Amino acid sequence: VDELLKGELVPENLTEDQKKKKKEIMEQESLWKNPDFKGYNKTFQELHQLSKTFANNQFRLALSNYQSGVNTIMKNRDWVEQYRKEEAEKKRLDEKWYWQKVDRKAREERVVYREKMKAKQDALNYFSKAINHLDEIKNPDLRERPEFKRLLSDVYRSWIMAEYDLQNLPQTIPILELYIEIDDNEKEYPAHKYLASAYSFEENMIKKTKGPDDMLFKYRYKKNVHLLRATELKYGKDSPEYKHIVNVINRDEVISV
Amino acid sequence: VDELLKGELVPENLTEDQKKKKKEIMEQESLWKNPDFKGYNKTFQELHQLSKTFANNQFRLALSNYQSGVNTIMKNRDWVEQYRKEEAEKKRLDEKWYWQKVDRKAREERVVYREKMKAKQDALNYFSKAINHLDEIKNPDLRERPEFKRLLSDVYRSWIMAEYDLQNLPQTIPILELYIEIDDNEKEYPAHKYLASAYSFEENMIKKTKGPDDMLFKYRYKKNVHLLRATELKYGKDSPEYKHIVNVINRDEVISV
Amino acid sequence: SEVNKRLRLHTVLFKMKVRTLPHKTVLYKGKPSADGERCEAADKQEAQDNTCLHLEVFDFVGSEDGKSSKNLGAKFKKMELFFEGSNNADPDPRKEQPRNLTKIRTYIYQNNFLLEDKVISVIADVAPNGEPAHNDKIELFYQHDDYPVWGTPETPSEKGVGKYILSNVENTKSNPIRNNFKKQFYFKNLDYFDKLFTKIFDYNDRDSNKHYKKNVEALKGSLKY
Amino acid sequence: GLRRAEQNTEDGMSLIQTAEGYLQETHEIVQRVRVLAVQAANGIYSEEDRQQIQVEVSQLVDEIDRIASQAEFNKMKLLTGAFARLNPTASMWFHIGANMHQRERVYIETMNTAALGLRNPTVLTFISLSTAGKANSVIGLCDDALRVISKQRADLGAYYNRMEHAAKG
Amino acid sequence: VSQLVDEIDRIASQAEFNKMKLLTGAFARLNPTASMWFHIGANMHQRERVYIETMNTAALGLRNPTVLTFISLSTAGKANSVIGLCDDALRVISKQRADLGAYYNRMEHAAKG
């Protein structure tokens, strides 16, 4: 069931009485046909924001950007694999010491790391444009369609993964909490694995900069909740990994005896 | 079959009813015979722009401009061949070191480059007048004749060849596209080889100046179209050259999975 | 033209799984709907019951000036290939023979939000293979601002409006509508989709080459110890 | 008409002169940022030492945005992109003739952090120097930013020189 | 130069006297569209003619009259060859100011008599 197979949000074309209304309105617009008309009051023309054609174009705009952002990530992975292949095949006629190999090997790691972060940044800009297009659809009826929920979760997942590689952990928390509220995404353990790390970053910063204890507990409480939930979804309840995490969480939090 | 060997666009000059019409027409003209007549209303004499004599004279003028431009390019090559001939023949009594000959060689190349670039602009002026001479022919029937398409494509090709040596790549795109809409010229790889370069230049500028992604994609797409088409027309599909170019385009273009 | 013969070769896509698609390109396989006007996407894309190829390329209004993201309108062009008879029994999509085309449907769409202007064009050629000249079996349908209603036949008093066939128009020297139609739109329309169909097959066929090579490469990793 | 067009030409130069004056401060800040990066790119400083350099960049970058927002001439913003070429919201025409259609247009580009490449026009994050690896790539960012400011002052300078001839003529 | 070349075009376009253009080539010598005649006598045929040549960028040589592209200083090779173009342009402007000066001196003698 590929909800994005047809590449649109909602299909478009029944009652004879309704078809009678469509006839007279089209006749009315023909009398008042003025292609140069621009409305001083935008309230009436803003009703087009609720139309299915409007939402269709917004979805196809967001879909257009999402494919661009995934392309940057995937084309980069191809380059890194190809880049390493070429280096091993060229002749090193001026290397007769082990330390020279480490120096040559160290350069490749930096070249690889340099291109990855460049590619990650391009994807995030592409993903961010797609997010704004999705959020300017004002009809809740069309926002519940399986086509919308498929791309909305797909966009957030790609945005979060790119953001975490750029080490912008605190920005993933607001997006991830919206991600796990769509369909059965809350049952995905990676979604709670990322929030386990992201909330740990928040706790460390509050600890480092010596913020309030209330915010310290909140980030610690959220960190343990999603650390446990991620453990349960992957290793199952009452499992040896689950028992270990509960011991860690019990030590990490406060218990009143 | 040589279209230009005839030397005209269309040979101007049957029915006894037509001959009756022609005789009574020339009698009416000879009654109002006034060689000093000049019309205040331009519409009636503009009907002569649809004549066969008007289009014939335009073809002769445009052909004359083409003939002059070709002689400019050809005579330039004759002189450069004669120029390099003289340089290596004359005695060098004050020459006994290597960089003496090398610096003498660099002088000749600079002279050659100046002479060539001057002839390219000198001939291009002829070609541009030919283009405007042909574009004012207002009879669609005569624009489909074999002679017109022979000269129009000949004029287009020389102007594109001259304009390319002047590094005016973006100005060749409109003319190259008009060249591949005449007879079977779309099947020539030189016409498609150039459009691959000219759209690469257009793609470089938008990337350099940080233009919109829309224009970047268009010039990227058009570059790949005429790059692949030229490879097919010279090496064939599923050829070793054709397969290589497809991998090049696949890396460049945006795909989805 | 002989292009429609080459469109017959594109039946290798029915039993080939499609994963690699170019940007803003939609493709699926299905069965004809009621009255065979369009295609309906199948629950399975590998079933032999599929006889229709659906290919769609969508764009945006204002993308020629860098204003695509402004949401000034929508546009897409899609072409559908219709086949008769079932697919071969073997599941391998590489070995497939060319098959006759029932009809070739072209759908042109362009809607401008700001101008409140919409142009929809449908062109179905119900005789693709079988006759070099089939002007009477080439259906056209032009609509503008929801007028006329879908399926309305052309009337003699209003030429070109609504559903009509290619033979109804003239092809005189004064108005070479049919000669221009073939030279300008339809010939180039077929070639673009023809290569685009071969584009998708080559990309996904290449995917099979990579996976076979990948396993061999992973095996060579044991040669170092 | 000739006298009134010469006063119009003076106000044209006065508008142009004011705009180029605002970019003198913008150019100085980027040079201050540029040399700060060359200091941070060296591997002797700790993370706290390169953070204090960032506290300067945070204030320096904010100033550049303030320059573009508040640079005015007769209640008209100039550096915020309202007079750019590609996507204008207004057109600046200087009527320098004594007749009907005698006018010339002036383009003033966007001159804020996003336009200079010091900020992301979508994410809205700006350049940082708190890491040695980041600081080295900022040197190229400032080189591009300087050329953008330098280019625009050349355009403003060319407009003034032309208008000066027209006022003289 | 893009500004300066445009200003030269503007000069010839808007150079006017009593709603008549002067520097657009109308009163030239080869292909005139109008004729400037000064009646400097009390009789029927006492008149003299004045020729004012075209003084825009194309006439000066700063731009190509056909392609409508002007000279560029963006390259050292093109900048070096521009120097001769600007040298010739001044000489063409020099002669025209010399031409008009001889008219003014002649009209001064004629008016005195």
Taking the CB of residue C10, how many other CB atoms lie within 10 A of it?
23
Cα-based torsion angle of the residue sequence A16, A18, A19, A23 in order, rounded to the nearest 10 degrees: 140
First to last CA, chain A: 52
Of B248, B221, B240, B242, nearest to B230 by C-alpha is: B242
Residue partners of B214: CB distance under 8 A and separation at least 6: C63, C64, C65, C66, C67, C68
Residue pair E54/E61 in contact (Cβ under 8 Å)? The answer is no
Q: What is the DSSP letter of D89?
A: S
Subunits with 3+ C-beta pairs closer than 8 A to D: A, E
Mode of pairing for the β-strands spanning C117-125 and D92-94: unpaired
User: Using the beta-carbon criterion (under 8 Å), do B255 and C64 form an inter-chain contact?
Assistant: no
Q: Which region holds residue B151: left if phi is over 0, alpha if psi is between -120 and 50, else beta?
A: alpha
DSSP conformation letters of chain B: --STTS-SSS-----HHHHHHHHHHHHHHHHT--TT---S-HHHHHGGGGSHHHHHHHHHHHHHHHHHHHHHHHHHHHHHHHHHHHHHHS--TT--SHHHHHHHHHHHHHHHHHHHHHHHHHHHHHHHHHHHHHHT---TTGGGSHHHHHHHHHHHHHHHHHHHHTT-HHHHHHHHHHHTTSTTGGG-HHHHHHHHHHHHHHHHHHHHTT--HHHHHHHHHHHHHHHHHHHHHHH-TTSHHHHHHHHHHHHHS-EE-
Of D111, D131, D32, D102, nearest to D67 by C-alpha is: D111
Q: Using a CB-CB distance cutoff of 8 angstroms, which residues of chain E are in contact with residue D5?
A: none
Residue pair C200/C10 in contact (Cβ under 8 Å)? The answer is no
The CA distance from A5 to C39, in Å, is: 14
* Chain C residue with Cα closest to B206: C66
Residue pair B159/B171 in contact (Cβ under 8 Å)? The answer is no
The radius of gyration of chain C from alpha carbons, rounded to an integer in Å, stands at: 21
Cα-based torsion angle of the residue sequence B92, B98, B99, B103 in order, rounded to the nearest 10 degrees: 50
Task: Mark the breaks in chain D: residue after which each occurs, C to N over 2.5 Å.
Answer: none
Residue partners of D106: CB distance under 8 A and separation at least 6: D12, D15, D16, D83, D92, D93, D94, D159
The CA distance from E93 to C217, in Å, is: 77
The radius of gyration of chain B from alpha carbons, rounded to an integer in Å, stands at: 26
The CA distance from D40 to D141, in Å, is: 14
Peptide bond into C32 cis (omega under 30): no
Residue partners of B249: CB distance under 8 A and separation at least 6: B224, B227, B228
Residue partners of E63: CB distance under 8 A and separation at least 6: E5, E57, E69, E70, E71
User: What is the separation of C-alpha C208 from the centre of its chain, rounded to a whole number of angstroms?
Assistant: 25
The answer to whether residue E66 neighbours chain B at the CB level (below 8 Å) is: yes
Q: Residues in chain D, how many?
A: 169
Cα separation values, C133 from C105, C137, C138, D45, Å = 17, 9, 10, 81
The CA distance from C155 to C152, in Å, is: 9
Q: Where are the beta strands (DSSP E) in chain D?
A: 72-73, 76-77, 92-94, 104-106
Residue partners of A53: CB distance under 8 A and separation at least 6: A12, C74, C111, C113
| Physical contact, C and E (3 or more Cβ pairs within 8 A) | no
What are the b/e assignments for A217-246, b being 16+ CB within 10 Å?
eebbebbbebbbbbbbbebeeeeeebeebe
* Chain B residue with Cα closest to A75: B251
Residue partners of B29: CB distance under 8 A and separation at least 6: none
**What's the token pair of residue A37?**
């008309």
Q: Using a CB-CB distance cutoff of 8 angstroms, which residues of chain B are in contact with residue C173?
A: 141
Position of tokens 């340099």? A114
Collect all residues from B whose CB is shorter than 8 A from any CB in A.
Answer: 213, 251, 254-257
Q: Where are the beta strands (DSSP E) in C128-183?
A: 138-144, 162-165
User: Using the beta-carbon criterion (under 8 Å), do C20 and B141 form an inter-chain contact?
Assistant: no
* Chain C residue with Cα closest to B216: C66
Of E80, E83, E61, nearest to E5 by C-alpha is: E61
Q: Residues in chain B, how many?
A: 257
* Chain E residue with Cα closest to B113: E77
Cα separation values, E31 from D36, E24, E26, E96, Å = 66, 12, 8, 17
Q: Using a CB-CB distance cutoff of 8 angstroms, which residues of chain B are in contact with residue E67?
A: 124-125, 128
Q: What is the DSSP letter of A97?
A: S
Interface test with B, best of C24, C27, C60, C63 (most B CBs within 10 A): C63
Q: ∠D19-D24-D30 over CA atoms, to 5°? A: 125
The CA distance from B224 to A73, in Å, is: 22
The alpha-helical segments, DSSP class H, found in A90-212 are 98-134, 140-143, 146-165, 169-179, 189-209
Q: What is the DSSP letter of D112?
A: S
The CA distance from A238 to A231, in Å, is: 10
**What's the token pair of residue C167?**
């033979």
User: Using the beta-carbon criterion (under 8 Å), do C64 and B212 form an inter-chain contact?
Assistant: no
Bridge partners, residue E20, by sequence: E17
Taking the CB of residue C106, how many other CB atoms lie within 10 A of it?
19
Residue type, B28: Q
Position of tokens 């349908």? C141
**What's the token pair of residue B141?**
């029937």
**What's the token pair of residue A35?**
């292609």
Residue pair B120/B167 in contact (Cβ under 8 Å)? The answer is no
Mode of pairing for the β-strands spanning C52-60 and C39-41: unpaired
The answer to whether residue C94 neighbours chain B at the CB level (below 8 Å) is: no
Residue partners of C175: CB distance under 8 A and separation at least 6: none
Q: Using a CB-CB distance cutoff of 8 angstroms, which residues of chain A are in contact with residue D137?
A: none
Long-range CB pairs of A92-96 (<8 Å, 24+ gap) are none
